[PDB]
């Protein structure tokens, strides 16, 4: 009845904004050649401005667990909360990552988020967490639901 | 000389450290040693001293005393046991915010529980005598209102784990042991005719409050012994806080629906009379998913390590016992083709838990078989696998051809294909071991009955047998442990491996045959069938297959 | 009552464990020695066992307290017995005289690398008797 | 156990009891006196007359009741019996009855059972339910007396059993030690008995039971216990009159229950409790033995006083909190503290459960008037002080207090804001519970840390209500509460010099999850940084309008000092939470991640700047009195101590450029300031002491562990010379304690040894003028000279010298000759001190070896050697 987000599926990570008393839907976008840094493109103004979903679509290759990530760092599937995922940018073929090289945007704690070619390292892997209290860790992720990702390398959320 | 002084110093370091370490008891003053002796004497002797008086006390307390001798000129006097149970019931029925701990109830519930059970091949006469004695001893209590009291205490518990709840659960198990129909009927009538929602709410609260394996606490304990800290408690019960409580709580729920009590089985799923309904069937499968997740995480922690330590082995044993009890409880709810519970479990989260158990069984068996020290853990794990397959076979009860439950089950097997493949390879290998050891070529290698075969002779016997591949050869050599003489006892080897394969793989063979017959046109299933041909061919002499007219007025194969 | 050279031998034995030189054995200072001998202690075990010897209660045993624990035990003849105990076990030859050839062989156990020839230069200093092969008597001269 | 050879139970109560019991004191009720001591204690009464009349009246009541007269005394059987039996029970509890009186009054209860080798006792009289309950109470007391007699007999047996066991262990140990050697005795399984803790030794010795029989104790000693245990079992009843109180009670309770349907729930409860006690006599010992303690004869009086104080405190539970009750309980707690048994016997202290009584007395006060603020604040302080001292007494007390950690941290905010209350808050009790116990720190859980993290977040978010009510400026945060919540986290994460990584990872993760706990400066949005925060705090400290409330002095929380202490505590906590060095060498991802997170949170430049901040030196006034800068308000060396700890544990000093830059910017000025305050008058100043403590505990060991980095510093010539001169001046300083002097000696010996030979010429030109004095201060210079002249022997002897270093300039040779001659003369004309002579001889020999035998001194002498500028008078 209800679908479930599984591997090898193309999705867009969309975030909402409440700037100046209105709900604004924004999508995470990045383009391979040129600037590797990720930016946000408006999607609520689709009637006025056509969004560029080409740089917004991402592919979910693996949904391995944290222990599997630890083992492969030492060296077709349904996503479950608390697992490490590998988002691949469809257009560029470069995986999302925490660049760990901040641009010094006021808050010194945060780092920059972009695309990196190499798959090795813990920067590319991201752990999904259930925003909804009804959802639980280990439970399968619904297609329509809220997520809060955590960077393995930096222990920071996509903010 | 100076170098010699340094050389001498190295051993002199040991002397000073040794005398510092020296703490003989005689140096202690008299009072300190006397106090330590009092504590040691207490623990070693007074606590360990045991005497059996529960049956005597209950029999004396249940006797109506001299009623014809002294005339009350009133209502029939209640026996002292009846008065005690009535007091305990009234205390529970009294409205209080919390269930206060009471020593009298704690002691007397234990006494009554011991009285009920009062505990090589027993004959039929002795078995029937024991059943009659158990029935009479349980009647001695449920004729005075213990079945109602054990429900009232659980209701007043308000879903809070405590020794009071543990004693109540033990008493309930004692009175329900063997599937007491009269006690089941009394409990069900009580619950129905006073519409108790607190009982089910407290049951749900307790089942949420039940604990599982904790890698964090176990790793903290590991760091403790690694630093060298002595175990204050030998149990180390920070991991798996209350295994006894969890097992007792689930055994209570299993004995409640034993004997296929369709009425109580349905009433657990849906309390029709009550205003609010709680799904114990779904709560149980939720706890099963929690415990299987904990077990999988513990296995993942022990994946890299070559050998399992004793602490990990005992934690695995306790978790396996808990999971086995939960699986038995789920089986008893889906026994007696109870369609409602079958559908509920089919739509519930049982499938991914079984998938997880399948991976654990596939890898844990491979890991344990090589090492010869923890064969008991392997046996417990395979017993858990047997109970899981029994649960699946009960799930398939009353299934028509091309049934939806069977279809979901084949999807589960397809999802867990590789683990099923490895389990089937394991069983096929250790069942063909018997044909290998019965081959006459091996008897020609070892003509006399001493049975002391050499490693190389066994290796070339396997090649002469030719049925095994090189990978199978290496794996059997690894799983075969021999002394430095390379002298191995194939007799103990086969008695240690084949019979367990024989009596667990039968359930897998039966499940696969059932699925194959009830789905004659499922393409994916013939892959597992052709992978398990050898197991099926071995178990063909032992598999009895008949058809009967089932309770659903339809022909069923048994 | 303690014999004068025994305290002097207790002086050096005290300094053998008092690396810092202040005359106070801290728990960590004592602890590193016990790891060096192979045993792995907990901090509580070390601090528990150090309390019994500490009569003052300062947490660090001084030499006057150290003497009392030394007086607790019978080192009546254990000193030279251990000296002979080493001479017996260092006598791999068993001739009653210990050769210099295995002198380098046991000092390597601690990790020293002093050359083969130079030790028999030092054993010659030990061999004021001139034996050319060290006995217990030379060991007594050494100690 | 048994009065005579035949195993017959003695009459309950009758016997010799030696267990300590509360003292009986009474006061005469006289109203003509003008004294007030009589108000203490209960009024006197004729106890013997009351006892005799009670016995007579009970006898008459029993003899008359059996005939069932129409008119009893008072009109009813209940009125006749209940008050009289209540008075009898009270007298029996007080213990007035003795010997024949007890015999008669027990015969009045049951003639057949208690007759000593017709009329029916009280137990067969068809009594009402209140009378039955009052008789159940009497039977319970008799059973308790039997249990006490059993416990006393067990303690009697233990006296000689333990003595003979100890003698046997001495004999066995002597035989084993004759067999083996002390050095080899550390190993070998035979010595495991003696190396085991005493509790484990007794556990192994008491293996007589069953068939295993692996205990080393012989059969002659085994038989005594294998007889006493069965005697105790027989006395407990584990193996025609009933002849036993146990059987009498067991029959009576069941007979009553089957005779009548009891309506009163209390009677049913009492009867079944008593029946279970009769049928579970082993449980009585199982419960009593853990509460049984043994004391020597000398400690009896002090134990009695401690028990009286405990009784007073326990009895004050039943009365409501108030002025006089607070005074009484505070005085009693002080009495318990002053008692020596409180220290000598902590096991008895815990068995009596005084800590639970203090738990209850604190809970009552804390729960009383939560909205109207915690009334009786001195009481909470005294209770918390008693509890912290209880934790400090013994390790097991910390375990006992760890069980109430959830409540204490839930009430952690009772009195943190109020000053002068340090060590008297529930947070302090929690810190003492989880202080320096590695097992307890490991057992500490995550939600417990989360509670403290939330409290710290609130205190960093909003201001202090009490401070802004007293009139302090309303800054946007509360540093006073934070400096305590951070100290608790420090004690939780850091234990015994090592860092508990499991707790450190949780604390760091929660602190970065909620970043407002870091203070407004380090919050990250428009934050001026740690260095600017310290500068602003210094300025607000000099400003009196913002430092104080400006509407006592100890109550005055200087806002600048509070801010500075908060930031220092946060930095110290983070540095302690930093992963250990060996784990970074191993390369664990978690440790690397934590280290990187801490580096991101705190920059290097901020730490360097805060270290570069200078103090305010004390100065002498015209009159001749030193003016003392205030330490409740100002920049303190303890603040920089945490900065250096963070620098060492997080960033690490591994490069010589950074080492020298830090030495120039922050460390050397402090050394010079100490070397200037080392004057005679300024030495006793709080500044000299605090600065010396900070130096010798943080800076000097850091430079000692970073000693090898000083190898290739040829192009920094003047910096190392200044460092050596300042360190030597600090060593020559007088106010230093022994540990400080040792630290200075070790650091100077390491740095000088690692240093190049040519650089220490300026140190030699001061050492040659000081060493010949050969005073007590000259111990360290002799060793330094020995090590230097041994290491750099080729530099002086060989004409080429060290190939890279070179050779002497002949001025070093002249200085070495003067040193040699001065040392030789001073040793010649000074009195023999063995230590001085054992240290000076190697130095003299090393100098003689270093000096070439063909040495040519030059007709060069030096011009106006600046000896006066280094002489002690004025120090310049
Ligand atoms: Ca001392
Ligand atoms: Ca030799
Ligand atoms: Ca010789």
- Domain boundaries in chain C? 3-76, 77-143
Other C-beta atoms lying within 10 Å of the C-beta of residue B477 = 14
**Strand partners for B487:** B454
Other C-beta atoms lying within 10 Å of the C-beta of residue B380 = 18
| D298 inside 8 A of chain B by CB | no
- C-alpha to C-alpha distance for D126 and D252, rounded to whole angstroms: 12
- C-alpha to C-alpha distance for D387 and D393, rounded to whole angstroms: 10
Contact C82 D497 (CB under 8 A): no
Other C-beta atoms lying within 10 Å of the C-beta of residue B146 = 27
- Cα-based distances in Å from A27 to A94, A102, A105: 18, 21, 20
Identify each DSSP E strand in D527-659 by its residue range: 619-620, 626-627
Contact B229 D439 (CB under 8 A): yes
Residues in chain B with CB shorter than 8 Å from the CB of A65 are 300
Cβ A40 vs Cβ A26: under 8 Å: yes
Torsion D423-D427-D429-D430 (CA) sign: negative
Residue B551: how many CA atoms within 13 Å on its side-chain side? 7
How far, in Å, is the centroid of ligand 2 from the Cα of C120?
Answer: 13
Cβ D518 vs Cβ D428: under 8 Å: no
Residues in chain D with CB shorter than 8 Å from the CB of B29 are 296
Three-state DSSP class for B97?
coil
How far, in Å, is the centroid of ligand 2 from the Cα of C141?
Answer: 17
CA distance B238 to chain C (A): 21
Contact D738 C22 (CB under 8 A): yes
- C-alpha to C-alpha distance for D252 and D127, rounded to whole angstroms: 12
Contacts of D415 (CB under 8 A, 6+ apart): D374, D377, D380, D381, D421, D424, D425
- Chains touching C (at least 3 CB pairs under 8 A) are B, D
Within chain B, what is the greatest distance between any pair of CA atoms?
107
Q: How distant is the alpha carbon of residue D630 from its chain centre?
A: 31
Name the nearest CA neighbour of B480 among B444, B449, B456.
Answer: B456
Closest ligand (CA of C100) = 2
Q: Give the burial string for D293-325 (b: 16+ CB within 10 Å, else e).
A: bbbeeebeebbebbbebbeebbebeeeebeeeb
Q: Give the burial string for D621-633 (b: 16+ CB within 10 Å, else e).
A: eeeeeeeebeeeb
Cβ B163 vs Cβ B153: under 8 Å: no
**Strand partners for A59:** A10, A88
For helices B163-176 and B103-117, the axis angle rounded to 10 degrees is 20
Resolution rounded to one decimal, in angstroms:
3.6
| A112 inside 8 A of chain D by CB | no
Residues in chain A with CB shorter than 8 Å from the CB of D601 are 109
- C-alpha to C-alpha distance for D468 and D565, rounded to whole angstroms: 19
Contacts of A44 (CB under 8 A, 6+ apart): A23, A24, A25
Instruction: Please give the backbone phi and psi of residue A89, each rounded to the nearest 5 degrees, phi first.
Output: -70, 120
Torsion D596-D598-D602-D605 (CA) sign: negative
Provide the chain A residues 55-94 that lie in CB contact (below 8 A) with chain D: 73
Q: How many residues does chain C have?
A: 143
Both tokens of B216, joined, read: 């964090």
| C128 inside 8 A of chain D by CB | no
Instruction: Please give the backbone phi and psi of residue D143, each rounded to the nearest 5 degrees, phi first.
Output: -60, -40
Residue A52, Ramachandran bin (φ over 0: left; ψ between -120 and 50: alpha; else beta): beta
For helices B146-157 and B163-176, the axis angle rounded to 10 degrees is 150
B and A make contact (3+ CB pairs below 8 Å): yes
Within chain D, what is the greatest distance between any pair of CA atoms?
137
- C-alpha to C-alpha distance for D137 and D89, rounded to whole angstroms: 8
Judging by DSSP bridges, how do beta strands D26-27 and D42-43 pair with one another?
Answer: parallel
Three-state DSSP class for B91?
helix
Contacts of B284 (CB under 8 A, 6+ apart): B207, B250, B253, B326, B329, B330, B333
Residues in chain D with CB shorter than 8 Å from the CB of C74 are 177
| A138 inside 8 A of chain B by CB | yes
- C-alpha to C-alpha distance for D10 and A36, rounded to whole angstroms: 95
For helices D738-754 and D779-791, the axis angle rounded to 10 degrees is 20
Burial of D547 (0-12, 13-18, 19+ CB in 10 A): buried
Identify each DSSP E strand in D145-190 by its residue range: none
CA distance D752 to chain B (A): 27
Planar angle of CA D859, D863, D865, nearest 5 degrees: 120
Planar angle of CA B90, B94, B98, nearest 5 degrees: 125
Name the nearest CA neighbour of B410 among B337, B533, B519.
Answer: B519
Residues in chain B with CB shorter than 8 Å from the CB of D583 are none
- C-alpha to C-alpha distance for B250 and B284, rounded to whole angstroms: 9
**Residue carrying structure tokens 């909205």:** D371
Both tokens of B76, joined, read: 């029939």
- C-alpha to C-alpha distance for A29 and A113, rounded to whole angstroms: 11
- C-alpha to C-alpha distance for D309 and D315, rounded to whole angstroms: 10
Cβ B164 vs Cβ B101: under 8 Å: yes
- C-alpha to C-alpha distance for C77 and B203, rounded to whole angstroms: 73
Instruction: Please compute Rg for chain B using Cα positions.
Output: 29
Specify the DSSP element, H or E, that contains A15.
strand A14-17
CA distance C34 to chain B (A): 7
Q: Do domains C3-76 and C77-143 have the same CATH topology?
A: yes
- C-alpha to C-alpha distance for B352 and B348, rounded to whole angstroms: 10
Residue D220, Ramachandran bin (φ over 0: left; ψ between -120 and 50: alpha; else beta): alpha
**Residue C138 marked ligand-binding:** yes
Closest ligand (CA of C91) = 2
**Chain A nearest-CA residue for D588:** A74
Contact A67 B297 (CB under 8 A): yes
In CATH terms, the superfamily for domain C3-76 is EF-hand (1.10.238.10)
**Residue C78 marked ligand-binding:** no
- C-alpha to C-alpha distance for D805 and D358, rounded to whole angstroms: 71
- Cα-based distances in Å from A120 to A74, A83, A116: 11, 17, 10
Name the nearest CA neighbour of D673 among D719, D630, D615, D725.
Answer: D615
Interface test with D, best of B16, B28, B46, B55 (most D CBs within 10 A): B46
Both tokens of B145, joined, read: 């209102």
**Residue C24 marked ligand-binding:** yes
CATH number of C77-143: 1.10.238.10
DSSP output for C87-112: HHHH-SS-SSSB-STTHHHHHTTTT-
DSSP tag of B303: T
Contact C20 D437 (CB under 8 A): no
Cβ B160 vs Cβ B172: under 8 Å: no
Both tokens of D765, joined, read: 């030109």
CA distance B223 to chain C (A): 12
Interface test with B, best of D161, D254, D258, D505 (most B CBs within 10 A): D258
- Chains touching A (at least 3 CB pairs under 8 A) are B, D
Both tokens of D574, joined, read: 């983070």
Within chain A, what is the greatest distance between any pair of CA atoms?
50
Instruction: Please give the backbone phi and psi of residue A41, each rounded to the nearest 5 degrees, phi first.
Output: -120, 135
**Residue C81 marked ligand-binding:** no
Contacts of A21 (CB under 8 A, 6+ apart): none
Contacts of A143 (CB under 8 A, 6+ apart): A2, A3, A4, A5
- C-alpha to C-alpha distance for B375 and D380, rounded to whole angstroms: 59
- C-alpha to C-alpha distance for B192 and B268, rounded to whole angstroms: 11
Contacts of D729 (CB under 8 A, 6+ apart): D675, D678, D875
Burial of B131 (0-12, 13-18, 19+ CB in 10 A): exposed
Q: Helix H segments across D295-370?
A: 300-315, 323-338, 341-344, 346-351, 354-367
Specify the DSSP element, H or E, that contains D495.
strand D494-495
Give B488-496 contacts, CB < 8 A, sequence gap 24+: B488/B452, B488/B453, B488/B454, B488/B455, B488/B458, B489/B451, B489/B452, B489/B453, B490/B437, B490/B442, B490/B446, B490/B451, B490/B453, B490/B458, B491/B451, B493/B433, B493/B437, B494/B433, B494/B434, B494/B437, B496/B375
Specify the DSSP element, H or E, that contains B504.
helix B490-518
Residues in chain B with CB shorter than 8 Å from the CB of D257 are 61, 65, 80, 83
Name the nearest CA neighbour of D650 among D694, D606, D682.
Answer: D606
**Chain A nearest-CA residue for B302:** A67
Q: How many CB pairs under 8 A join A and D?
A: 20
Contacts of D458 (CB under 8 A, 6+ apart): none
Closest CB to D183: pick one of C39, C42, C82.
C82
Both tokens of D705, joined, read: 């562990």
Both tokens of B457, joined, read: 């002779």
Cβ B225 vs Cβ B267: under 8 Å: no
How far, in Å, is the centroid of ligand 2 from the Cα of C101?
Answer: 9
Burial of D688 (0-12, 13-18, 19+ CB in 10 A): buried
- C-alpha to C-alpha distance for D777 and D225, rounded to whole angstroms: 66
| B289 inside 8 A of chain A by CB | yes
Contact C22 D739 (CB under 8 A): yes
Planar angle of CA A34, A39, A41, nearest 5 degrees: 115
Q: How distant is the alpha carbon of residue D679 from its chain centre?
A: 38
| D856 inside 8 A of chain C by CB | no
Both tokens of D325, joined, read: 């009750």
Instruction: Please give the backbone phi and psi of residue B479, each rounded to the nearest 5 degrees, phi first.
Output: -75, -10
Planar angle of CA D166, D172, D176, nearest 5 degrees: 140
Q: How many residues does chain D have?
A: 876
How far, in Å, is the centroid of ligand 3 from the Cα of C134?
Answer: 3
Cβ D154 vs Cβ D109: under 8 Å: no
Contact D525 A109 (CB under 8 A): no
Cβ B430 vs Cβ B498: under 8 Å: yes
Closest ligand (CA of C127) = 3
Other C-beta atoms lying within 10 Å of the C-beta of residue C64 = 10
C and A make contact (3+ CB pairs below 8 Å): no
Three-state DSSP class for B240?
coil
CA distance C50 to chain D (A): 13
**Chain D nearest-CA residue for A122:** D589
How far, in Å, is the centroid of ligand 2 from the Cα of C94?
Answer: 6
Contacts of D457 (CB under 8 A, 6+ apart): D514, D516, D517
**Strand partners for D495:** D498
- Cα-based distances in Å from D38 to D13, D28, D43, D44, D308: 32, 7, 8, 10, 18
Residues in chain A with CB shorter than 8 Å from the CB of B417 are none
Both tokens of B515, joined, read: 């699925």
Q: How many residues does chain A have?
A: 159
Burial of D678 (0-12, 13-18, 19+ CB in 10 A): buried
Cβ D554 vs Cβ D419: under 8 Å: yes
- C-alpha to C-alpha distance for D499 and D508, rounded to whole angstroms: 13
Q: How distant is the alpha carbon of residue A145 from its chain centre?
A: 14
Contact B289 A138 (CB under 8 A): yes
Instruction: Please compute Rg for chain A using Cα positions.
Output: 16
Judging by DSSP bridges, how do beta strands B452-454 and B487-489 pair with one another?
Answer: antiparallel
Residues in chain A with CB shorter than 8 Å from the CB of D526 are 106
Both tokens of A147, joined, read: 């997520």
Instruction: Please give the backbone phi and psi of residue A52, each rounded to the nearest 5 degrees, phi first.
Output: -100, 85
DSSP tag of B46: I
Contacts of D566 (CB under 8 A, 6+ apart): D479, D482, D483, D486, D519
Other C-beta atoms lying within 10 Å of the C-beta of residue C28 = 11
- C-alpha to C-alpha distance for D515 and D522, rounded to whole angstroms: 8
Name the nearest CA neighbour of D679 among D876, D811, D454.
Answer: D876
DSSP tag of A98: E
- C-alpha to C-alpha distance for B536 and B513, rounded to whole angstroms: 8
Burial of B505 (0-12, 13-18, 19+ CB in 10 A): buried
- C-alpha to C-alpha distance for D170 and D162, rounded to whole angstroms: 12
Cβ D459 vs Cβ D477: under 8 Å: yes
DSSP tag of D10: P
Name the nearest CA neighbour of D492 among D545, D536, D443.
Answer: D443
Contact D589 A107 (CB under 8 A): no
Cβ B497 vs Cβ B433: under 8 Å: yes
Name the nearest CA neighbour of D453 among D520, D516, D533, D379.
Answer: D516
- C-alpha to C-alpha distance for D435 and D392, rounded to whole angstroms: 9
Cβ B101 vs Cβ B163: under 8 Å: yes
Cβ C143 vs Cβ C83: under 8 Å: yes
């Amino acid at each position: 009845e209800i679908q479930f987000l599984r591997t090898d599926d193309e999705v867009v990570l969309q975030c909402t904004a409440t700037i100046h008393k209105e709900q604004q839907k924004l999508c995470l976008a990045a383009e391979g050649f040129g600037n590797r840094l990720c930016f946000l493109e408006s999607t609520s103004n689709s009637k006025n401005v056509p969004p560029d979903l080409s740089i917004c679509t991402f592919v979910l290759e693996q949904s391995l667990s944290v222990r599997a990530l630890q083992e492969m760092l030492a060296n077709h599937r349904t996503l479950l909360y608390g697992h490490a995922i590998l988002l691949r940018h469809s257009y560029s073929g470069m995986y999302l990552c925490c660049l760990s090289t901040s641009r010094s945007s006021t808050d010194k704690l945060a780092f920059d988020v972009g695309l990196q070619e190499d798959t090795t390292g813990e920067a590319c892997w991201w752990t999904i967490h259930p925003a909804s209290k009804q959802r639980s860790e280990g439970e399968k992720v619904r297609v329509g639901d809220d997520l809060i990702l955590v960077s393995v390398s930096s222990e920071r959320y996509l903010h | 000389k100076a170098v010699w002084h340094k050389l001498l110093s190295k051993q002199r370091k040991r002397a000073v450290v040794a005398c510092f370490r020296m703490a003989p008891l005689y140096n202690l003053p008299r009072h300190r040693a006397v106090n330590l002796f009092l504590q040691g004497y207490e623990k070693s002797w007074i606590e360990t001293e045991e005497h059996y008086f529960e049956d005597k006390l209950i029999e004396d307390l249940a006797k109506p005393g001299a009623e014809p001798p002294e005339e009350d000129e009133g209502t029939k006097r209640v026996d002292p046991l009846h008065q005690l149970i009535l007091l305990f019931s009234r205390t529970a029925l009294t409205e209080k915010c919390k269930l206060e701990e009471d020593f009298l109830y704690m002691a007397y519930a234990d006494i009554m529980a011991k009285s009920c059970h009062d505990e090589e091949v027993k004959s039929f006469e002795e078995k029937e005598m024991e059943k009659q004695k158990l029935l009479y001893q349980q009647a001695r209590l449920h004729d005075r209102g213990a079945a109602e009291m054990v429900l009232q205490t659980i209701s007043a518990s308000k879903g809070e784990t405590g020794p009071m709840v543990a004693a109540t659960l033990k008493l309930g198990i004692a009175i329900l042991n063997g599937g007491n129909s009269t006690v089941q009927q009394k409990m069900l009538d009580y619950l129905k005719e006073k519409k108790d929602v607190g009982f089910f709410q407290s049951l749900a609260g307790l089942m949420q409050s039940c604990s599982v394996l904790d890698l964090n606490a176990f790793e903290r304990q590991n760091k403790a012994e690694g630093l060298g800290m002595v175990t204050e408690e030998g149990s180390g019960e920070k991991v798996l806080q209350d295994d006894e409580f969890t097992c007792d709580l689930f055994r209570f729920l299993q004995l409640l629906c034993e004997g296929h009590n369709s009425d109580f089985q349905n009433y657990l799923r849906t309390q029709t009379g009550n205003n609010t309904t709680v799904n114990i069937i779904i709560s149980t499968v939720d706890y099963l998913l929690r415990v299987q997740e904990s077990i999988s995480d513990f296995y993942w922690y022990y994946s890299g390590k070559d050998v399992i330590d004793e602490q990990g082995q005992r934690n695995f044993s306790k978790a396996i016992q808990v999971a086995k009890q939960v699986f038995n409880t789920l089986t008893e709810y889906i026994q007696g083709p109870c369609t409602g519970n079958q559908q509920s479990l089919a739509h519930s989260r049982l499938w991914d838990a079984v998938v997880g158990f399948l991976h654990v069984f596939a890898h844990m068996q491979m890991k344990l078989s090589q090492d010869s020290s923890q064969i008991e853990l392997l046996k417990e794990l395979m017993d858990l696998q047997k109970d899981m397959v029994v649960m699946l076979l009960s799930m398939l009860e009353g299934n028509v051809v091309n049934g939806t439950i069977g279809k979901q089950m084949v999807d589960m097997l397809v999802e867990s294909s590789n683990n099923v493949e490895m389990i089937l390879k394991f069983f096929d290998m250790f069942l063909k071991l018997k044909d290998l050891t019965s081959s006459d070529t091996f008897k020609e290698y070892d003509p006399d009955g001493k049975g002391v075969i050499s490693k190389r002779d066994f290796h070339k016997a396997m090649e002469s047998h030719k049925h095994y591949t090189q990978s199978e050869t290496e794996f059997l050599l690894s799983c075969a442990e021999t002394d430095e003489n390379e002298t191995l006892d194939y007799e103990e080897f086969v008695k240690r491996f084949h019979e367990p394969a024989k009596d667990i793989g039968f359930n897998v063979a039966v499940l696969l045959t059932n699925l194959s017959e009830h789905m004659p046109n499922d393409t994916r299933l013939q892959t597992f069938l052709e992978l398990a041909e050898s197991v099926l061919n071995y178990f063909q002499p032992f598999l009895g297959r008949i058809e009967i007219m089932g309770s659903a007025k339809r022909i069923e194969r048994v | 009552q303690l014999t004068e050279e025994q305290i002097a031998e207790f002086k050096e034995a005290f300094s053998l464990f008092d690396k810092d030189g202040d005359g106070t054995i801290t728990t960590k200072e004592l602890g590193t020695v016990m790891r060096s001998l192979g045993q792995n202690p907990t901090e509580a075990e070390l601090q528990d066992m150090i309390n019994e010897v500490d009569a003052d209660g300062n947490g660090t045993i001084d030499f006057p307290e150290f003497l009392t624990m030394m007086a607790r035990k019978m080192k009546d003849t254990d000193s030279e017995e251990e000296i002979r105990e080493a001479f017996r076990v260092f006598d791999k030859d068993g001739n009653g005289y210990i050769s210099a050839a295995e002198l380098r062989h046991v000092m390597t156990n601690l990790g020293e690398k002093l050359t083969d020839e130079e030790v028999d230069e030092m054993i010659r200093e030990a061999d004021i008797d001139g034996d050319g092969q060290v006995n217990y008597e030379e060991f007594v001269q050494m100690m | 156990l048994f009065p005579d050879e035949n195993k017959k139970h003695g009459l309950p109560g009758i016997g010799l009891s030696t267990s300590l019991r509360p003292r009986m004191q009474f006061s005469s009720p006289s109203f003509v006196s003008i004294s007030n001591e009589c108000y203490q204690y209960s009024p006197e009464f004729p106890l013997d007359i009351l006892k005799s009349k009670t016995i007579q009246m009970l006898t008459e009541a029993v003899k008359e009741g059996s005939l069932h007269a129409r008119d009893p005394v008072g009109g009813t059987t209940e009125f006749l019996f209940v008050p009289l039996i209540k008075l009898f029970y009270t007298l029996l509890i007080m213990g007035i009855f003795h010997n024949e009186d007890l015999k008669h009054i027990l015969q009045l209860i049951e003639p057949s059972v208690f007759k000593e080798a017709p009329k029916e006792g009280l137990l067969q009289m068809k009594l009402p339910e209140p009378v039955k309950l009052q008789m159940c109470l009497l039977l319970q007391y008799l059973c308790d007396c039997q249990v006490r007699h059993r416990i006393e007999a067990i303690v009697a047996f233990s006296d000689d059993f333990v003595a003979k066991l100890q003698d046997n262990q001495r004999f066995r140990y002597n035989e084993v030690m004759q067999a083996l050697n002390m050095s080899a005795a550390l190993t070998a399984r035979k010595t495991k008995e003696f190396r085991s803790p005493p509790q484990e030794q007794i556990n192994m010795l008491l293996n007589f039971k069953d068939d295993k029989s692996e205990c080393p104790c012989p059969e002659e000693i085994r038989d005594q216990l294998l007889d006493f245990h069965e005697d105790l079992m027989t006395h407990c009843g584990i193996e025609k009159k009933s002849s036993t109180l146990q059987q009498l009670i067991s029959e009576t309770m069941v007979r009553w229950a089957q005779e009548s349907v009891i309506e009163d729930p209390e009677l049913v409860r009492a009867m079944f409790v008593l029946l279970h006690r009769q049928y579970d006599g082993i449980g009585g010992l199982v419960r009593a033995l853990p509460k049984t303690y043994t004391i020597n004869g000398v400690s009896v009086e002090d134990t009695i006083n401690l028990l009286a104080s405990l009784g007073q405190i326990r009895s004050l539970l039943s009365v409501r909190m108030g002025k006089e009750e607070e005074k009484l309980m505070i005085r009693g707690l002080g009495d318990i503290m002053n008692n020596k048994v409180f220290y000598q016997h902590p096991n008895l202290m815990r068995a009596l459960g005084m800590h639970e009584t203090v738990m209850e007395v604190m809970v009552n006060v804390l729960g009383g008037g939560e909205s109207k603020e915690i009334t009786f604040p001195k009481m909470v302080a005294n209770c918390c002080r008693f509890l912290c001292y209880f934790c400090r007494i013994s390790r097991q007390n910390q375990k006992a207090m760890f069980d109430h950690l959830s409540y204490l941290l839930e009430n952690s905010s009772v009195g943190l804001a109020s000053p002068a209350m340090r060590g008297s808050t529930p947070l302090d009790v929690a810190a003492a519970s989880v202080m320096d116990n590695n097992e307890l720190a490991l057992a500490l859980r995550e939600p417990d840390l989360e509670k403290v993290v939330r409290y710290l977040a609130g205190c960093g978010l909003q201001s202090c209500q009490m401070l802004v009510s007293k009139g302090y400026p309303d800054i946007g945060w509360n540093p006073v509460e934070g400096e305590r919540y951070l100290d608790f986290l420090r004690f939780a994460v850091f234990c015994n010099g090592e860092s508990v990584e499991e707790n450190a990872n949780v604390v760091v993760r929660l602190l970065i999850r909620r970043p407002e706990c870091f203070g407004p400066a380090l919050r990250g949005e428009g934050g001026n940084g740690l260095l600017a925060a310290m500068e602003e705090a210094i300025k607000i400290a000099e400003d009196p309008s913002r430092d104080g409330p400006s509407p006592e002095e100890d109550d005055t929380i200087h806002m600048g000092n509070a801010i500075m202490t908060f930031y220092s505590a946060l930095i110290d906590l983070l540095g302690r939470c930093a992963p250990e060095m060996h784990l970074i060498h191993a390369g664990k991802g978690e440790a690397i991640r934590i280290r990187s997170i801490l580096r991101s949170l705190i920059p290097l430049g901020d730490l360097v700047g805060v270290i570069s901040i200078a103090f305010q030196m004390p100065t002498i006034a015209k009159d001749g009195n030193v003016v003392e800068p205030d330490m409740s308000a100002g920049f303190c060396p303890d603040h920089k101590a945490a900065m250096v700890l963070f620098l060492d544990r997080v960033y690490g000093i591994e490069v010589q450029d950074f080492l020298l830059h830090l030495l120039e910017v922050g460390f050397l000025p402090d050394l010079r300031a100490a070397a200037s305050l080392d004057t005679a008058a300024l030495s006793a100043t709080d500044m000299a002491l605090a600065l010396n403590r900070y130096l010798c505990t943080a800076v000097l060991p850091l430079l000692t562990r970073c000693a090898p980095l000083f190898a290739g510093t040829e192009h920094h010539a003047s910096l190392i010379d200044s460092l050596l001169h300042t360190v030597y001046r600090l060593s020559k300083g007088c106010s230093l304690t022994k540990a400080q002097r040792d630290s200075i000696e070790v650091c100077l010996l390491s740095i000088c040894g690692q240093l190049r030979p040519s650089m220490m010429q300026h140190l030699l030109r001061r050492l040659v003028f000081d060493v010949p004095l050969l005073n007590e201060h000259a111990k360290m210079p002799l060793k330094l000279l020995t090590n230097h002249y041994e290491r750099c022997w080729k530099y002086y002897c060989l004409p080429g010298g060290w190939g890279n270093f070179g050779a002497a300039s002949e001025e070093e040779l002249h200085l070495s000759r003067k040193l040699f001659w001065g040392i030789f003369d001073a040793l010649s004309q000074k009195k023999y001190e063995q230590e001085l002579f054992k240290l000076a001889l190697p130095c003299l020999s090393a100098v003689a070896g270093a000096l070439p035998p063909d040495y040519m001194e030059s007709n060069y002498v030096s011009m106006m050697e600046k000896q006066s500028s280094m002489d002690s008078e004025g120090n310049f």
